[PDB]
Amino acid sequence: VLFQGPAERISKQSTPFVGAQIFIEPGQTQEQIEQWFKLLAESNMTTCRIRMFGKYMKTPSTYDFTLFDRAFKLADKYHIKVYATLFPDTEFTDVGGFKFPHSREHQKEVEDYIKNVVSHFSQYKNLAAWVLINEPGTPNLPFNEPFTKERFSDWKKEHNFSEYNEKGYPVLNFEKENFIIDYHNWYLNWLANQVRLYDKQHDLHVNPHNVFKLSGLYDFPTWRTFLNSLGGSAHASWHFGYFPRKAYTVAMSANAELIRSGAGELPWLMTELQGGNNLYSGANPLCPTAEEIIQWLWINFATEAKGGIFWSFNARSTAAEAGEWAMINFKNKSSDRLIAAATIGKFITENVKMMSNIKTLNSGISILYNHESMWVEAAQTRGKLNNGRSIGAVMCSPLSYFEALSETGLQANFKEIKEFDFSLNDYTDQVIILSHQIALDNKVIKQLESFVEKGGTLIADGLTGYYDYQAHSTVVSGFALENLFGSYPIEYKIKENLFSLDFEKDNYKLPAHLWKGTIETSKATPIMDKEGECIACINQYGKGKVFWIPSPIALGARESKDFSELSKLTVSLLPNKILNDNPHFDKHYKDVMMKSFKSNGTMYSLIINKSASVQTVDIVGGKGKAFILFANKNAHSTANKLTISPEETVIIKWK
Template sequence: MNKNNLTFLLLLSCFLIILKSEAQENNLHQFGAQVFIEPGQTEQETEEWFRVLKENGMKICRIRMFESYMHKPDGSWDFSLFDRAFKLAEKYEVKVYATFFPLTEKTDIGGWKFPKDQKQLEQFSVYIQKMVSHFGQFKSLYAWVLINEPGGGLKDNDFSRQMRTQWNKDNPQKEYLPNGYPVLADLQDYRFKRYMTSWMLNWIAKEVRKTDKNVALHVNNHAIFSNAQEYDFPYWRTFLTSLGGSAHASWHFGQFSRDEYALAMSANSEIILSGSGDLPWIMTELQGGNNTFSAYNPMCPTEEEITQWLWTVIGTEGVGSIFWSLNARASGIEAGEWALIDFQNKPTDRVFAIKEVSKCIDRNADTFQNIRKAETGVNLLYVRESIWAENVLTEGLPAVDDGRKTEMKDLLGYFQAFSEMGISPNIKAFEEFDFTKSDYAGTTVILANQISIPTRYASLLKNYVENGGTLIIGGLTAFYDENLHNTMLSGFPFKDLYGGEISEFKYLDEPKTFNVFSHKLSGEKWKGLITPEKESTILSKDQDEVLAIRSNYKKGTVIWLPTLLGTYARNQTSKPLSALLMDICDVTKDFRFEGHHSDVLMKTLKKGKQYVTVIINKNKEKQALAIRTGNENLKPKIIFSNKNGILKSDSVEINPEETMVLIWE
C-alpha cells in the first residue's frame, strides 16, 4: 500500500467515526413512518399525516418516489404531488428518507432490483438525476434510499448476461485444487449474485454523487436470515452514510413463533449492527399495522410489540426506526394494510406506544447521546459459503427440517441460549470479525454448523485461538471447503487447531444426550465421531465413540461439539445449552441474569460509567430477575415501564409482555 492510499484510509476512518458521532447527535434515536404518497390524496389529509408525526414524537419519515406518478407519457415531469409532501415535511419539521422507485409494473409492490437491459439502466440514471436535482432544494430531504430491499431479483436477461461475461473473465472458476482434486461443484452463481447486489448499489450511489456530494445515502436490506448470504456490508460502508434494514414480522420471521418476535428482532438488529461498522444504523422498516392479504401470516402488532421492537433496536445501538407505514395505500396490492393510523387518519394505540418511547428518549437525552452496546466478547459467526453450500446440496429436496438445510437455525439456537441468560452476543459475517489483534483473552467465537469453511480461514482461526481466544465448533462445521470438497478426504486444514478429526458423521433420528462438563445436553440430527489427538481432552464419550473434545492451542482453547446443540435449543429448550455456555465462555463480568429465564431477553448499553438495560418479558408468567452486574456499587432506576414492573432490593419484577428500561449508575 502506498503512502497516498494509507493517508486516504486514515482520513476515511476518521471521517466515518465523526459521521457516526454526528448522526447519533443530530438524529438521537428518531422514530417515524412511511408516508405513502399516491394520486387522489388531498392536501388536507396529507397535512393530517405530517401533523400526526409531529404530535407523536416522530421526527423522520420515508417517502417512496414513484417515477410512474411524476414522469408523464409525453416525456415531461410533474413533481407537484411530491413537492407538496416535502413542503409539509418542512412545515412540521420532519426529515425525509426518499426512496428511489423507478418505473415498474403496476403490480410490483417492491420494485425491481436490477435493470433488464442497458436502456433501462440509462433510464434509471435519468430518473436519479431528476430526483436528486429537483428534491435537493428541500431542507426536509435528509437521505436517499438507494433501492428498496436489495437482495434477490437477479434474472437471466441481457443486462445480467453482459455483466456475467466480464465477471467470469475476472473471476475464473478453478479446475483443480493445488493437491490435485478436481473442482466439480459450481458456486459461481452465488458469488456473482453477491457481486451484482453490491455493484448495483454502488452504481446508484455514484449516480447520486454526480449531482449531490453531501446528501446522506442509505439502504434497507431485508429478510436478513436468508439474504445475508448476498450482502457485503463492509464494502457497502465505502459509499453509504448509514445502514438500514426491513424487519417485518409477517414477512421475515417465519422460522419464529409470535412469542419469539422480540428474539428475532434482537438477532436481526445484531446482524445489521455488525454490518454497519462505524456507520450509524436504523431499522428502516418495521410493521406498523395489520397485514390483511399480504405476507405469510396475517397479524396486527400490539402496542406492546411495537414498544418491544423499538427498544430492541435502541438496545442494539440503532439510532432510529421507521414504520411501514403511517397511512395505508388506497390502490393495488396491500391497499388498506400496514398502517399505524386508522381509516379516518386517527392515531391508534400503536402510535401512542411510539410516542411514549420517544418521550422517554427525549427525557433522557444526555444518557442516550452516543451510547454504545456493551461488548459481551461473544461472537456468533456465519459463513456465506456455508449457506451457498446448503442451497446447492439440498436443491429440490425436502431438507428444511431434517438437519440438511439449517441456514442460521443452529446459530440462532446459541443466540437464544445466551439471550435467555440476559446476554446479547454479536452476530457477524466471518469477514466482519477482526482477526488482526494480538490478544483475544476473554472472547469467544462460535461456528455453529457452518458446513463450508474456506480453506484460507484456517490461518485466521489459528491466529485467534493461539492469541488467547476460545473457539466453539458445532455441527458439521468445516465438513466442506469453499468448493464443496469433503475436507476429511481432501486435506483437513483444522486438524491441529481442533485437536483431532472426524472418522464419520452419523444421522440421528432422535436427539442424542451428551454429558459435557457435568451438563446433560441434547443434540439433533448429526453425531460426529471424533478421532482425537493425544493432547486433546475427551469431554464426552459413549462407549468407544468420542463425541466432544477440548484442545488447548497455545494461549487459547477449542471446544468441539459436532452435533446440532443450537437446533435442539430452538426446537425444545435452550436451558441446558445456556448452562454449558456460562461455564466455557468468559461472560461472568458482563451484565446478565443470575439464572436462565425462558422467553426473556436483555440488551445492555454503556456510556462511560453508566449502563442502560432493556429487558423484555415474552414469558407467560411474571419474572423475578436477579441481574449480575459485576459491580455492586451500580444502582438501578426505572426510566421506562409499560406494565408497572418494579424494582426490589435483590431483583426486578417484570410482567408478561412488559418492556422495562433501567439506568445503572
C-alpha cells in the same frame, strides 16, 4: 463541518428518532396529507420516508414533481425530515421494486430518473437521506433478463476458475453466488455515484431485508465504501419465519446485531418496522401489539440504531396492501401502536444525552455466519425448505445459540466472518461461536488458529468445517481443522430429528438434531458418551481453548424448543471475566431476554418478558444498584431482582 453545510448529516452521536413511511400516490387530497403530517408531529416522530415513485412523476411525453412537492412542503411545515427512496417507474403490481436494471435501455431510464429526481428534491432543506434502492436483493435474481445475463457472462470472462484445486481434487467455484455479491456491490455503488453527480450534500442509505435468508447476497464491508448509514427492513410478517411470535424479541435482536455488524464504523437505523395489520399480505401475518412496538424500538436503540421507521404511517389504497400496515386507523387517528411509538419519541426528547450516545455493551461473544456456509448448504440440500437437510440450518444453528444467550441475559454479536476483526494481538476473554458453519477455508482457519493462540475461546458444533469454500470436504481429503481442534472426525451417523447425547460422567444429556458425530483426539482431551464413543473434546491451544462437539446441539435445542441445556453448557465455557463484568441472569430464563448498553460511562440494561407469567429475574455481574428508568407495566426491583410482567419492556439504569 464545512462540506456538511446545512443538511444535518448522520453520525454515531446523532439523536435517535422514531418515524414512519408517508405513503404518497395520486388521488390523495391536501387535507388528508396534512392530517397525516400533523398527527405524525404530535406522535413525537421527527422523520418520514417517501417512495419517490417514477410512475407518479412521469407525464405522457418529462418529469412533473407536483405530487411529491405537495408532500415535501407539508413535511417541512411540520418540521419533519424525509428519507427519499429512489424508486424508478415499475408495474403498479410490483410492490417492492426491481432490484437491477432489465436492459441497457432501462439503465438509461434509471439514469434519467435519478438526474431529474435528485436535481429537484436535493433543494428541499428537510431532505435527510437518499435511499439508493428499496430492499436490495431478492431470492429470484433475474439471470434470464438481458442486462444481468450480459453482466454474468462478462464477470465469468474476467474471472479464471479451474475445475480442480491445487491438490488436484474436483471443486465447485460458486460463480453465480460470487457474481451476485459483486453485482449488488456494482449496482448500489453505481446508484451512489449517480446520486453524487447531482447531490454531494445528503446522506446515502439502503435497507437490506429478509437478512436471515438474503445475508448471502450482501457484502456490507464493501457497501460502507459508498454509504453514510446502513438500514434494514425487519418485518415480523415477512422476515421472522424461523421464529415463533413469542421470540420476535430474539429475531429483532439478531436482525439488529446483524445490521450493526454490517454497519461497522457507519451508523445504522431500521428503515422499516411493521407498523400495522396484515389483511391479505405477509407470510406470517399479524397486527403488532402496542407491547411489541415498544419491544422492537428499545431492542433496536439498545443495539445502536439511530432510528426506527414504521412501514407505514398511512395505508396504500388500491390492490396489494390496500388499508394494510398502517399505524393510523381508517379515520386517520392513532391506533394503540402509534400511541406506543409516541411514548418512545417522547422518552428520547426527555433523555437526549443518554439516547444520543448509546454503545452496546459487547460481552465479547461473537456468533459468526459466513456467505460460503449458506452457498455450500444450498448446493448440498439441493433447495429442500423446512431442518439440517434443508435451506436455513446454517442460520437457524447460530440463531439458536443467540437465543440461548438471550435467555441467559448475555449480549452476543451476530456477524459475517469478514466483519470480525482477526488482526488483534490479544483475544483473552473474547469468544467465537461457529455453530454449523459447514464451509471454512484455509485462510479463515489460520485466522481462527491466531484467535485461539492469543487467548480466544472457540465453540464449534454441528458440521462446522466439514467443507471448504469449494464444497471440498477436508474431513475426507485431510482435515484442515485437525491442528486447531487437536482431534479428527471418525463418523457421522444420521439419527431421528431429535436424539440425546448421553455423556459418560454425571448422567448428563444434550438434545441433538439429525446427525451424531464421533471423533478421535490426538492433543485434545476426549469427552465420551455412555456407549463409549468420543462425541466432543477440549483442546488447549496457546493461551486459548477450543470446545468441539460435531453433533448439532444448537439445532437440537431448537428442535426441542428448550435452550436451557445449551445456555448452561455455553456459560460453563465462557471466560470468568465475561460473567463478572457483564450483567446477566443468575440462571437461564425461558422466554426472557436482556441486553446491556452504555451511554457516556453509565451502564443500562433492556429486559423483556415474553413468557405467559410474571418473572422475578435475579441480575448478577457488572456493578451498581438497579433504577427502573422505563417500564410500561409497573415492573419493580428489590436489590437486583426485577419483577417484570408478560410483554413488559424494562430499562434499568445502573447507579
